[PDB]
Each structure stands twice: as structure tokens, then as C-alpha cells.
Design a binder for this molecule. Structure first.
Ligand SMILES: C[N+](C)(C)[C@@H](Cc1cnc[nH]1)C(=O)O
Ligand SMILES: [Cl-]
Ligand SMILES: [Cl-]
Ligand SMILES: [Cl-]
Ligand SMILES: [Cl-]
Ligand SMILES: [Cl-]
Ligand SMILES: [Cl-]
Ligand SMILES: [Cl-]
Ligand SMILES: [Cl-]
Ligand SMILES: [Mg+2]
Ligand code: NI
Length: 431
């Protein structure tokens, strides 16, 4: 007897006995930030039930909801167990599953505070989740409110963009200032600038080594027909700048999960003031403080020959096989020989395979499992790269969030590699 609106409750004892069953899918309908580890209700242990998948209830309004569920390999023959902070949060999702051919759907009522409140119930979390902050956390930061995972007294919220101040002026987080990606990267090499330039740029934007920097960008639908599609991939540029700042030596860098979209989806107020910058005289630390984060072409070539290391190609498949260069300013087409392929998504200005539809980072278990299928594992020294280092930065940031101990970005990427005609390259569908 199937009931569309009254859902069977599964008990704690029943759920414990089902932990590790291959026919059970445990589904966490809270926000992705709570899933990652943020203790959004003040619970003592944050994260998700061990083995649970993430399906935020907010996605019920996505017309591709069923395609998401199927992409996550959640099948009708599976027993589905939903949980949230409350059982009431799961009722609409439970009904939606039943409306789409899923007949075995249950709701677990005792995740919080029963499961979160007992040491014997297993939970998982993203090891460095506090670097990927929710919109509620940023709102508390700028409001002077008491927030977890913050012990500083100096902060700056930074809106990233590529030569497009309209992305900032058309709507930004209150109090935030804008940072053009050209402030930290050079248009001649599309690599990070020299230490002396980075020191001046950071100071002029009001950033010291001991300043908590919160970075975000605005997605504005990049179109390859425009001259600068990167001006619309604002949140990749935010993560690009987060990489450069962490390389330079800013001790505490956070990224707003999902960028501007998360701020408006949370319903917070937005400002259009052109906030003047409050400069600081001294960055206060040698640049770079974390040089291991950045890999150049000589070290990258050594990594291609080392048993201990690997380059990770975070480009699209058309770029990989040499159909296109991916950019209107690169004529050479092909791939670096010996790199491990980890497809970014559709083109150079999208990161579909590393993101959800709302631009938050994809469930990290899925990324880790895909990576491990290709030999991309934390025991190696990995240098993520792409065209110019933007997409490689976002992949690098994801591995950083998992706590991987030796991950870097090969800054030069295909742009630098193909600019030397003596560098070997492959083309065509791999054989
Ligand atoms: C280095 N710029 C900003 C010129 C790149 C950045 C980039 C975006 N997606 C891949 N690379 C661009 O916009 O083509
Ligand atoms: Cl399971
Ligand atoms: Cl953390
Ligand atoms: Cl919070
Ligand atoms: Cl443009
Ligand atoms: Cl634009
Ligand atoms: Cl983006
Ligand atoms: Cl490549
Ligand atoms: Cl690392
Ligand atoms: Mg570069
Ligand atoms: Ni190798």
C-alpha cells in the first residue's frame, strides 16, 4: 500500500542495522554546508550520517531534480532513507521520490539531536569544511554576530571578477569591495604575479597576512561568443584568487560556497554602493609563505617523470582531444602528454563536474571516488592545471578541503606549455 503523503518512519535501531547495506541510500536533505560539517543548529558534532548522500531540499524547485537523483545513482530499486534536522524537512522530498517511481522511501526522525548527540553513531564531514563557508556565516561576520570557526578581529569580504566591475556594481554583499583578477595575475603569462606585485596589490586592497579574507564571485552565464567569457565566470575567479592569496601567505582564506547565488538564495540584502578600499601599509609576511601550492613548468615536467607525482588535467573533453583550444586567444590545440584527465565540464568557463547546479561544490565523496578511479589519490603530490590555472584552482581547492597533504596548481597550464614549440603534445581521441 503506497501512500504519497504519509511516509514510513525508520527507527534508529533499524537504520544502524542497515548501515553499509548496498541496497540502502541514506539521503541528507539539509544544506550542503551542514552536510560538509557546519553545525548550523548548534549541534556538537557536525556532518552527515556515515555513507549518506547530499540532496538539499532547496533543489526540489530545480526542474532537473530527477536527473540529479539519477546522476547520483539513486535508483528505484534502492531503499531510500531521508533525514534532515527535523523529519518535517523530509516530507516534500519523500513525496517527490514517490511521485517518480520510487516505492521504498522512509524518513529517519532522530538524526538531531539523537544521532548527532551520541559518540557511538558514525558521522562523516569534510576535513577542512571551515574554509568553505555558508552564506549565514558571512552574514554573521559582517553583522558583528557571534559565529563559529572564527577567532579573528579583522576581515574583508572580496567580490572577484575579471575586468568587469559591473559584476560587482550590479549587486554585491554589503560592505564588500571588488578585486579584479588582473590585480593578482599577469595578462602576459596568466600566471600569478611576482611577490613584490602581490604585496602591493594585497595592501592596496586592504589585506594583510592576518586578515580573514572571504572571497566570492558572481555567475553571469559565460558565452563563448563574447570577447571575455571569463568576466561571467566570477566564482571560479574567486577560487582562483583564493589560491593565489593562500600561496602568497594570507593565513585565513574562506570561499563562500556557491558564490553570489547562495547569498541571494538565502534572502539576504544586497548593496550596490561602490565601496572605497581601505588600504593597509604592510602585508606583514614574506611572499610567498606557501610556495608549495604553486608549480611551474620545470617542476611540472619533473612530476611527469616521478613515481610520487602526477599532473591532473582539468579541461573539457573537446580541449583534451584537440578539437578546440578552449580560448579565443590560444591557437594551439592539444594536450600535455602524461597527465591524468579529470574532465572539468562543458568548456573552459564551466565546472559542471565539480559543482552542483546552484554552483556549490559537488558532494565531495563523488569527487573523491571519481578521482580515485583514475589514480588521483592523496598519497601523491598532485599539480592540477587547465588552460590558464582557473579551473585547476577550483579542483585544487576541492582537494584542499578534503585535507589532501600535497596538492598544487601547475600555474602555466596549456597556455604556457603550448607556447614553447619544443614541448611535446598529443592530439586526437586517445588510443
Ligand atoms: C586568465 N583569464 C582571466 C584571461 C582566463 C581565465 C579562465 C577562465 N576559465 C579558464 N580560464 C579567461 O577568462 O579566459
Ligand atoms: Cl550505505
Ligand atoms: Cl574545518
Ligand atoms: Cl553560522
Ligand atoms: Cl565580454
Ligand atoms: Cl559579461
Ligand atoms: Cl563561476
Ligand atoms: Cl592538457
Ligand atoms: Cl595541500
Ligand atoms: Mg597561469
Ligand atoms: Ni607520473
Amino acid at each position: 500500500h503506497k501512500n504519497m503523503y504519509d511516509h514510513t518512519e525508520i527507527t534508529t535501531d533499524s537504520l544502524l542495522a542497515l548501515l553499509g547495506s548496498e541496497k540502502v541510500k541514506i539521503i541528507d536533505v539539509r544544506s550542503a554546508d551542514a552536510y560538509n560539517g557546519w553545525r548550523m543548529r548548534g549541534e556538537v558534532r557536525g556532518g552527515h550520517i556515515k555513507g549518506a548522500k547530499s540532496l538539499p531540499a532547496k533543489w526540489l524547485t530545480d526542474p532537473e531534480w530527477l536527473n540529479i537523483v539519477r546522476f547520483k545513482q539513486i535508483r528505484p530499486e534502492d531503499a531510500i532513507v531521508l533525514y534532515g534536522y527535523t523529519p518535517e524537512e523530509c516530507e516534500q522530498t519523500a513525496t517527490r521520490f514517490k511521485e517518480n517511481g520510487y516505492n521504498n522511501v522512509s524518513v529517519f526522525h532522530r538524526f538531531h539531536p539523537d544521532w548527532t548527540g551520541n559518540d557511538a553513531f558514525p558521522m562523516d564531514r569534510l576535513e577542512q569544511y571551515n574554509r568553505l563557508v555558508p552564506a549565514e556565516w558571512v552574514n554573521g561576520l559582517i553583522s558583528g554576530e557571534e559565529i563559529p570557526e572564527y577567532d579573528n578581529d579583522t576581515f574583508i569580504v572580496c567580490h572577484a571578477h575579471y575586468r568587469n566591475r559591473d559584476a560587482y556594481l550590479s549587486g554585491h554583499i554589503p560592505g564588500a569591495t571588488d578585486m579584479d583578477t588582473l590585480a593578482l595575475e599577469s595578462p602576459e603569462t596568466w600566471n600569478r604575479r611576482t611577490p613584490e606585485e602581490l604585496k602591493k596589490a594585497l595592501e592596496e586592497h586592504g589585506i594583510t597576512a592576518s586578515t580573514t579574507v572571504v572571497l566570492y564571485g558572481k555567475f553571469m552565464h559565460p558565452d563563448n561568443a563574447d570577447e571575455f567569457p571569463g568576466s561571467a565566470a566570477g566564482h571560479i575567479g574567486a577560487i582562483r584568487l583564493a589560491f593565489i592569496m593562500m600561496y602568497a601567505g594570507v593565513e585565513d582564506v574562506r570561499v563562500l560556497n556557491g558564490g553570489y547565488q547562495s547569498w541571494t538564495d538565502a534572502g539576504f540584502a544586497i548593496s550596490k554602493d561602490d565601496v572605497p578600499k581601505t588600504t593597509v601599509p604592510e602585508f606583514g609576511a614574506p611572499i610567498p609563505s606557501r610556495p608549495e601550492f604553486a608549480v611551474d613548468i620545470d617542476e611540472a615536467k619533473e612530476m611527469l617523470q616521478s613515481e610520487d607525482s602526477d599532473l591532473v588535467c582539468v579541461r573539457s573533453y573537446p580541449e583534451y582531444i584537440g578539437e578546440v583550444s578552449g580560448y579565443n586567444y590560444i591557437k594551439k590545440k592539444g594536450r600535455i602528454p602524461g597527465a591524468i584527465f579529470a574532465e572539468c565540464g562543458s568548456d573552459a568557463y564551466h565546472m559542471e563536474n565539480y559543482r552542483n547546479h546552484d554552483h556549490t561544490t559537488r558532494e565531495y565523496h563523488e569527487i573523491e571516488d571519481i578521482w580515485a578511479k583514475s589514480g588521483i589519490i592523496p598519497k601523491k603530490h598532485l599539480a592540477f592545471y587547465c588552460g590558464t590555472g582557473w579551473r585547476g584552482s577550483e579542483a585544487w581547492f576541492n582537494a584542499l578541503l578534503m585535507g589532501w597533504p600535497r596538492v598544487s596548481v601547475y600555474d602555466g597550464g596549456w597556455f604556457e606549455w603550448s607556447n614553447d614549440p619544443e614541448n611535446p603534445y598529443e592530439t586526437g581521441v586517445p588510443k
